[PDB]
Amino acid sequence: PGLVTPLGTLLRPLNSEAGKVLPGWGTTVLMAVFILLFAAFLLIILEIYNSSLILDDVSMSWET
Amino acid sequence: AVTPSLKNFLGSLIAGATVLGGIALAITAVSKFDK
Amino acid sequence: DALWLPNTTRPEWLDGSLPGDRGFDPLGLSKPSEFVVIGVDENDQNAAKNNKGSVEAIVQATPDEVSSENRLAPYSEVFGLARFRECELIHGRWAMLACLGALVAEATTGVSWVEAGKVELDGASYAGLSLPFSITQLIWIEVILVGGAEFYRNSETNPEKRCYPGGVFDPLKLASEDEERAFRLKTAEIKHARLAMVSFFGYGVQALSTGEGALGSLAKFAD
Amino acid sequence: IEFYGPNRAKWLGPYSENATPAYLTGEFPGDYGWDTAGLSADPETFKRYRELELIHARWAMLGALGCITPELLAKSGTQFGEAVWFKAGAQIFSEGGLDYLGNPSLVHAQNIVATLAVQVILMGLVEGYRVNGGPAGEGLDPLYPGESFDPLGLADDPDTFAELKVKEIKNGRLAMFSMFGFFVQAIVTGKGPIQNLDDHLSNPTVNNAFAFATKFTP
Amino acid sequence: IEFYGPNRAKWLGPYSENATPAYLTGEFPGDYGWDTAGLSADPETFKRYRELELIHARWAMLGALGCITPELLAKSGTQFGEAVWFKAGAQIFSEGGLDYLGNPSLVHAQNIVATLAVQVILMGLVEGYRVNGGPAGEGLDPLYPGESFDPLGLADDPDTFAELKVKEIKNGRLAMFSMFGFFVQAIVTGKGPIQNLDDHLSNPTVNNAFAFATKFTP
Ligand code: CHL
Ligand code: CHL
Ligand code: CHL
Ligand code: CHL
Ligand code: CLA
Ligand code: CLA
Ligand code: CLA
Ligand SMILES: CC1=C[C@H](O)CC(C)(C)[C@H]1/C=C/C(C)=C/C=C/C(C)=C/C=C/C=C(C)/C=C/C=C(C)/C=C/C1=C(C)C[C@H](O)CC1(C)C
Ligand SMILES: CC1=C[C@H](O)CC(C)(C)[C@H]1/C=C/C(C)=C/C=C/C(C)=C/C=C/C=C(C)/C=C/C=C(C)/C=C/C1=C(C)C[C@H](O)CC1(C)C
């Protein structure tokens, strides 16, 4: 018994799903795979930017 | 087109995985031994 | 009889009542699995000793695929046949129209579906006939007409008729009032849809592989 | 002329090979009773040798026809680069990778160790399916599955099915003999087999096989 | 026991055709069931194959470690002249005989045929002892004797002793596989194995193995 707007009627199924969370593990292992890939990606760009990992198309000459 | 930097680099991504696998195997070798 | 894995372990919630049902779940994305409901924590900081959620509290909210009336999220769950049939049919019909249209445009004009925008923003030449429009007016007309079409197709409440509407307007020839004839037509349409979606995915991968035209790739193939 | 029962045609002929190895009297295709070593007195071992001979025959037909075909294509109307099944391995390291079918617009594959790893994974999965079934139908016959493997249904009549068994294993023994011929002449002539056939058509009696007999001289 | 019994870790995992050949169901260490050829259908023959395999394993351990050792010693703190097992055989013919550890303060034997005669005599005596059972322990088992020549004797607890059986057999199969690798590398590269490991670490994607894949061509 609160206040009613047309947006209050519209957006209510977005604020409906309160608590429907999965038993078991779910997508946790896949999440771990994406986290390890993201960590490896950051390690790649960090060593490129430090130039501890010299590539071919990467100049690092303050020049392009 | 692999430089020697990338050559000696990819062994580290191997080696860190081997270290974490050694951690996980050291967990499994005594944990499920006891239980 | 004709499964993707011929006489193997079938999924439990796939039988054959649906037309293109061949027992295909390695992932099980259409599973009838329930959802453990955890209540809200004691978020009243007037008093001491607030608490947390509730572990194995509710009877886990037996999932249903009944279409409601709410224009935002009508089906009230995503993982279910009563959404996935409609999603597969709509994606397949758009893929059939798109895969035919790319080939017909490449055959007539000679410009890819990839490079069609670059030759059609400067001149609206439908087969070289110089339509008067411009890109802004095209976006306005496209958005308002396809939006009116989608807001009128969502209004149907029958979960069968949200993909198989029937009636008078869309079935102009009334060739789907039969049982077995319409079942054969649905199980033909779903196979042609499954072909066209994979081939438009192949069009996208050929576009990623440094340009194509679906016959410009064949002109690359020419020898 | 029946290849079954006690009246199967021996490999010899009208000499019926008196005092046969008595542990096989028909009941299986390809039986001629030619067991001079007699390595299969135990029936379980004999079943294992049937399995192994069957799998080697069904590999050897493809191993024959894949070694015949591209040299015919290159001699007739195309060019493949290194169209000989010796240098089909060395085609990868030649210029820019292996171009299949002699076309530098299709497959164009490099990274031979990655190709080998893909080959290892695919062959391991299909062999692990091959042994104990799983998918592709229930594991029903280690010898002759043919449920979906015979999608035209030639296993209807059992007499014609045994006829196709006998034709199958006759042709399989021929293919296994021919591939050993390819492997011996691979060391001997160092050439293509169709080139060897043309050399025999040139010299049927003066360069036939014994010109290449003084090679292995210590 | 997870290692052997009705639920041993079978040699292909989930695809390991979980109904073994019925002539072996556990009862011995190192049993997975990989006799697909079926060459041990008789139990006495199977016993002979164990009798051969355990002896080959126990020689394979020492044959592995004797080849791993000297290049590691030459890298760490010593030198041997020729510290490589390839040309280690010709070191008696090298200048004046062989020097163990590279040290002419110890054995330095010459007259290689006389050393071979001493080897033949001592090996004939100890192999005859291994067959029949003689001094330094009476023969009770041809494979697992377990007597006063065990200065520690870890055959007390039966479960841990079965674990040691399984570990011995697994290390034996690994040592056999390693020595077969040493022999095939001895054929192919003509180089020391630790040198080959360093060369592969220097060039992983080019000097892997397929650089040495155009050698045995006609
Ligand atoms: C009528 C007489 C008759 C004769 C003589 C043979 C002969 C033979 N048949 Mg048989 N057959 C005959 C009737 C029939 N056969 C068959 C169908 C078959 C089949 C399907 C098969 C046979 C096979 C055999 C062989 C069985 C043993 C073997 O493998 O020898 C092989 C060993 C030799 C022949 C010795 C090699 C002699 C060679 C000239 C040596 C070359 C000298 C070199 C220069 C030395 C190298 C020097 C080096 C060291 C530097 C044997 C040669 C088997 C076979 O052919 O296997 C090879 C076989 O698979 N026969 C049919 C139709 C049903 C017959 C009907 O009449
Ligand atoms: C499995 C069948 C197979 C066989 C028999 C061969 C053999 C050959 N390859 Mg090859 N390959 C095979 C598959 C593959 N190869 C390659 C990659 C390459 C490369 C890069 C090259 C070769 C080359 C060669 C030739 C080397 C000549 C030689 O070593 O003499 C030994 C062989 C014979 C004397 C006759 C062959 C049969 C004989 C009875 C011995 C075979 C023994 C066993 C049946 C094999 C063991 C089975 C395994 C599974 C344990 C020869 C044609 C080289 C070449 O091109 O030379 C011109 C070369 O450069 N191969 C790959 C991708 C990784 C394969 C995948 O399956
Ligand atoms: C997950 C699936 C799985 C797969 C695919 C395998 C695979 C294998 N296991 Mg295995 N295992 C698997 C699960 C498990 N295994 C084991 C523990 C063991 C053990 C102890 C052993 C195996 C062995 C084997 C082999 C048995 C078949 C064989 O002999 O190869 C025959 C087929 C080939 C050799 C084909 C190889 C293809 C190769 C690329 C050819 C090379 C191409 C050349 C270029 C061509 C040649 C050219 C010429 C000139 C020479 C096979 C490689 C046996 C083994 O390692 O033998 C060596 C063995 O002793 N496994 C465990 C723990 C319980 C598992 C649990 O998951
Ligand atoms: C039994 C094990 C044994 C093995 C494998 C070898 C092998 C070798 N010895 Mg040798 N020897 C062995 C014992 C003995 N040797 C010698 C005395 C010498 C001398 C003076 C010389 C050698 C040399 C050699 C090399 C010869 C190259 C060659 O022929 O390539 C063929 C071999 C391969 C390509 C590798 C193996 C392939 C294959 C797996 C062979 C295995 C055969 C059988 C399976 C194992 C034997 C079974 C036995 C029980 C009958 C090679 C490293 C020569 C050398 O060092 O040159 C630089 C040399 O001058 N040996 C004595 C004292 C009399 C031995 C007694 O134990
Ligand atoms: C938990 C323990 C731990 C942690 C956090 C670190 C952390 C670090 N060490 Mg270190 N180290 C450790 C233990 C550890 N060490 C031990 C035990 C030793 C003794 C052997 C050493 C010896 C050592 C040396 C000698 C050096 C380091 C260095 C470093 C630094 C850089 C390492 C790098 O770039 O690799 C990056 C590694 C990763 C990003 C991990 C790989 C993860 C990717 C995504 C792969 C995914 C996992 C992979 C698949 C494997 C899984 C197996 C699979 C089968 C499941 C970093 C701070 C260096 C240093 O000090 O810098 C100056 C250095 O030179 N370490
Ligand atoms: C000509 C050789 C030949 C013959 C006579 C047979 C005969 C038989 N096979 Mg068989 N097989 C062969 C080759 C052959 N096979 C090869 C090479 C393989 C490996 C690919 C197999 C794999 C195989 C399996 C896995 C199974 C059989 C089965 C059978 C049996 C029943 C099926 C049947 O009637 O086949 C009759 C076959 C023919 C009449 C041969 C026709 C040859 C055509 C005309 C040539 C076409 C080749 C083509 C051009 C290749 C390129 C196409 C490719 C690019 C897609 C019968 C014993 C089944 C069985 O016994 O279970 C009951 C079974 O499960 N076979
Ligand atoms: C000295 C060689 C030798 C011998 C005699 C045996 C003997 C035996 N093994 Mg065994 N094995 C060996 C080496 C050997 N093994 C190696 C090197 C490995 C590791 C790959 C294994 C891994 C293994 C497993 C995983 C299992 C056995 C099993 C068995 C037993 C039954 C199988 C049988 O009948 O084998 C009889 C053996 C022979 C007739 C020897 C044939 C020698 C041929 C001629 C060698 C050349 C062919 C070879 C395949 C070439 C390719 C080499 C390549 C694979 C590296 C039997 C006691 C089973 C068991 O229960 O264990 C007790 C079992 O499940 N083996
Ligand atoms: C019965 C009897 C009796 C008495 O008593 C005793 C005795 C004598 C022992 C017996 C006999 C036996 C025999 C005869 C055996 C034989 C075998 C063989 C020959 C096999 C082959 C076998 C053969 C085979 C498998 C083959 C295979 C093949 C292959 C893989 C191939 C492959 C390939 C191809 C595709 C093509 C490409 O490009 C390349 C290559 C890579 C080249
Ligand atoms: C089981 C089965 C089953 C199924 O059914 C069938 C089949 C498959 C047939 C089967 C298999 C088999 C196999 C695989 C086998 C293998 C083996 C081996 C490899 C061995 C090694 C083996 C190896 C070995 C012993 C080795 C040894 C070594 C040695 C002594 C060394 C010595 C030495 C040294 C110290 C150093 C110096 O300076 C010198 C010399 C003098 C040189």
Structure tokens given for A33? 């795979």
Alpha carbons C76 and C83: distance in angstroms, whole number: 10
Q: What residues pair up with C131 in beta bridges, in sequence order?
A: C124
Written in H, E and C, the secondary structure of C25-42 is CCCCCCCCCCCEECCCCC
Half-sphere exposure of D29 (CA within 13 A, CB side): 21
CB contact (8 A) between residue D131 and residue E17: yes
Going by CA atoms, what residue is nearest to atom 2 of ligand 1? D12
Q: What residues pair up with C124 in beta bridges, in sequence order?
A: C131
Assign residue A22 the CATH number of its domain: 1.20.5.880
Alpha carbons C125 and C102: distance in angstroms, whole number: 16
Residue located via tokens 């001491």: C48
Determine, yes or no, domain membership for A46. yes
Alpha carbons E139 and C119: distance in angstroms, whole number: 94
CB contact (8 A) between residue C221 and residue D106: yes
Structure tokens given for C23? 């027992």
Alpha carbons E209 and D104: distance in angstroms, whole number: 27
Q: Method used for this model?
A: cryo-EM
* Count of domains forming chain A: 1
Mutate which of D82, D125, D131, D189 to disrupt the E interface (most E C-beta within 10 Å)?
D131
Domain that holds residue A2: 1-52
Helix E158-188 to helix E193-202 angle (10° resolution) is 70
Q: Which helix (H) or strand (E) holds A21?
A: strand A20-21
Q: Do D and E touch, counting CB pairs below 8 Å (3 needed)? A: yes
* Coil, helix or strand at residue D42: coil
Domain ranges in chain C?
10-210
Please tell me which residue of chain E has the smallest CA distance to D185. E218
Residues 6+ positions from E176 with CB-CB distance below 8 Å? E56, E57, E60
* Coil, helix or strand at residue C131: strand
Which residues from B are below 8 Å from E205, CB to CB?
2
Residues 6+ positions from D27 with CB-CB distance below 8 Å? D4
Alpha carbons D162 and D159: distance in angstroms, whole number: 5
Determine, yes or no, domain membership for A42. yes
Residues D175, D64 contacting (CB under 8 angstroms): yes
Q: Which of E34, E18, E67, E42 is nearest to E185 (CA)?
A: E67
- The alpha carbon of D53 is separated from its chain's Cα centroid by a whole number of angstroms, namely 10
Q: What residues pair up with D98 in beta bridges, in sequence order?
A: D109
Determine, yes or no, domain membership for A3. yes
Determine, yes or no, domain membership for A61. no
Structure tokens given for E134? 């003689």
Which residues from E are below 8 Å from D138, CB to CB?
none
Sequence letter at residue D69: T
Alpha carbons E66 and E81: distance in angstroms, whole number: 17
Query: What length is written for chain B?
Result: 35
To the nearest whole angstrom, how far is the Cα of B23 from the nearest Cα of chain E?
Answer: 22
Q: Which of B29, E20, E47 is nearest to D132 (CA)?
A: E20
Rounded to the nearest 5°, which phi and psi values hold at B29? -75, -20
Structure tokens given for C182? 């319409």
Determine, yes or no, domain membership for A57. no
Burial string for E170-184 (b: 16+ CB within 10 Å, else e) reads eebeebbebbeeeee
Structure tokens given for E129? 């002892």
Residues C23, C5 contacting (CB under 8 angstroms): yes
Which residues from E are below 8 Å from D190, CB to CB?
218
- The alpha carbon of E172 is separated from its chain's Cα centroid by a whole number of angstroms, namely 6
Burial string for E117-126 (b: 16+ CB within 10 Å, else e) reads eeeeeeeeee
Alpha carbons C22 and B2: distance in angstroms, whole number: 46
- The pick from B5, B13, B14, B18 for probing ligand 5's pocket by mutation, whose C-beta has the most ligand atoms within 8 angstroms, reads B13
Alpha carbons D108 and E102: distance in angstroms, whole number: 54
Surface-to-core class of residue C99, CB atoms within 10 Å of its CB (0-12 exposed, 13-18 middle, 19+ buried) = buried
Q: Which helix (H) or strand (E) holds A49?
A: helix A28-50
Rounded to the nearest 5°, which phi and psi values hold at E142? -75, -15
CA dihedral E185, E187, E189, E192 (to 10 degrees): 60
Determine, yes or no, domain membership for A58. no
CA distances from residue E133 to E26, E46, E130, E165 in whole angstroms, order as listed: 28, 22, 6, 21
Structure tokens given for C14? 């796939």
Residues D168, E54 contacting (CB under 8 angstroms): no
Residue E49 CA to ligand 7 center (angstroms) comes to: 9
Alpha carbons E6 and E11: distance in angstroms, whole number: 14
Determine, yes or no, domain membership for A62. no
